[PDB]
């Protein structure tokens, strides 16, 4: 019953045709799906498996393994907050407090409107700019609540 909208199916086909072998495209495909829906729809995996010429079992195992993928919560904007050593030293907890003040949620939670989800993540490889966070693909140093509020206001 579940079918990819044509615009998405087109993009997935592009990924599948990109590498020498179709199955190599699996992660690019899952990234694309998550970008489109705000999460990985469980019902998307069987059709994807068919495009990759892989068993469903295989695709499900890959989704489970890779931490960037989320099959449970739809969110327009994922706020990834680094919780590793350097950001911890330099103020992760201030960033989290500022986020709770602005958005009213904590790590793992989604806002009621489905707009923002806070995702605790390991080192983002921007340690000199600790504490670090991303909003979908954009990445930022946290300076203060006033500063963060202005950044978040850019995402509508």
């Amino acid at each position: 019953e579940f079918e990819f909208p044509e615009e998405l199916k087109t993009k997935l086909q592009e990924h599948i045709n990109y590498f020498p072998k179709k199955r190599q495209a699996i992660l690019l495909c899952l990234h694309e799906i998550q970008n489109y829906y705000g999460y990985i729809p469980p019902e998307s995996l069987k059709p994807l498996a068919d495009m990759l010429e892989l068993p469903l079992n295989h695709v499900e195992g890959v989704v489970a393994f890779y931490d960037m993928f989320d099959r449970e919560d739809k969110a327009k904007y994922r706020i990834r907050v680094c919780v590793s050593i350097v950001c911890h030293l330099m103020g992760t907890n201030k960033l989290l407090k500022a986020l709770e003040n602005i958005l009213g949620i904590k790590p793992g939670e989604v806002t009621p409107d489905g707009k923002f989800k806070i995702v605790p993540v390991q080192c983002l490889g921007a340690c000199s700019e600790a504490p670090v966070f991303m909003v979908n693909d954009d990445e930022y140093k946290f300076e203060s609540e006033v500063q963060l509020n202005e950044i978040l206001s850019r995402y509508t």
Partner: protein, 418 residues
Amino acid sequence: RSYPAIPRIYAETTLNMLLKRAKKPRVHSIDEYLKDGGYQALEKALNMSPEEIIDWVDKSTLRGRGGAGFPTGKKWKFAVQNPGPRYFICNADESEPGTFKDRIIIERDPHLLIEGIIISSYAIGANEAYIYIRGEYPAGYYILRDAIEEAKKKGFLGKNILGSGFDLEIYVARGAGAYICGEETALIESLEGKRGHPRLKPPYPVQKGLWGKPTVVNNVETIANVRFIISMGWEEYRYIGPSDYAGPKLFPVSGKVKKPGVYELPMNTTLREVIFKYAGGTLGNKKVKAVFSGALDCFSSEELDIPMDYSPLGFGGTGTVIVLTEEDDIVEAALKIAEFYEHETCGQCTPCRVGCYEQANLLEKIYKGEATEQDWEGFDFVNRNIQPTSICGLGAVAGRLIRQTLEKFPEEWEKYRK
């Protein structure tokens, strides 16, 4: 076009090689790259035999910048002893805490990396190369895709590159959240469209790698050196820095320093010089308590006069420098390291799977003051028993840094024990 927002990591160089352009926090596209002599080393390389290129890279003494320090030329030599086809892979998975050296080459000077990849691929006779970049570097991914297109348009990629008869395509793959996919065999498994589960080694990738064919995996920073070895020759390259450990090195410095960022320095620089001479000293001029070499090693304030080289008494690792000062709780920091290994064991090996989990779970109890006597003794035991039967380096080192803190800061731990 436009790329995702990136923080502007500070970068500084005394050598003006890897950071000649990347010291400025912006994308340098192919026209700017060409103005500086970009791709001329490739053109030179294509007029050389693969064997000669391998020889120069060997004689340069270049060692892997991905943490293990394996001689690059030797690695390449091993690959070409085996029948083709062969594959070349650039490891851009950079996910160890504190480590952000590779991204500034990728994001700011992508052509330096691409040029290196083409030369390297030519040297080992690979017609198919890959960049595996972590999923949390989306800007790096788009920057690379666009830079590869630029290189194609200028005739540096594709069939019969510059009339040489050498063919090459570079594919960019993305990770999706697993630190273990930086381990070369798990990376290859991920490239094959599977879970990132390390394979038993040997065989090494150079014997049996992608699709079971000879495969060279090298780190971004390693590959970024190749242009220079061809351009300058190996003799001049060996005159960079100390004769014993020659070449430029990138040092990502973070934590409690005034000038956190990436420093390009020779490897005779000391840890003390990195912190005080280059990175502006400590925040508040507080005393250094410890340096974490990423999530691998913990150096105390008594060990700052060591060289940043691949020597037995040297800093080693990837040159990652996380500075903790006198008010930083060592047990709290240790917990963060335990948490990383908990979140990144792939779970194939039993002591690694159980040990990384229990190390973190028990250390959290200790930190919060809820640990029983049994929990303390269990913590000690587990920390010492993550490595048995491990098939990759994660299980081998998941207890390492924490053990060093137990040995180096006993008084601080003892206060938690009581």
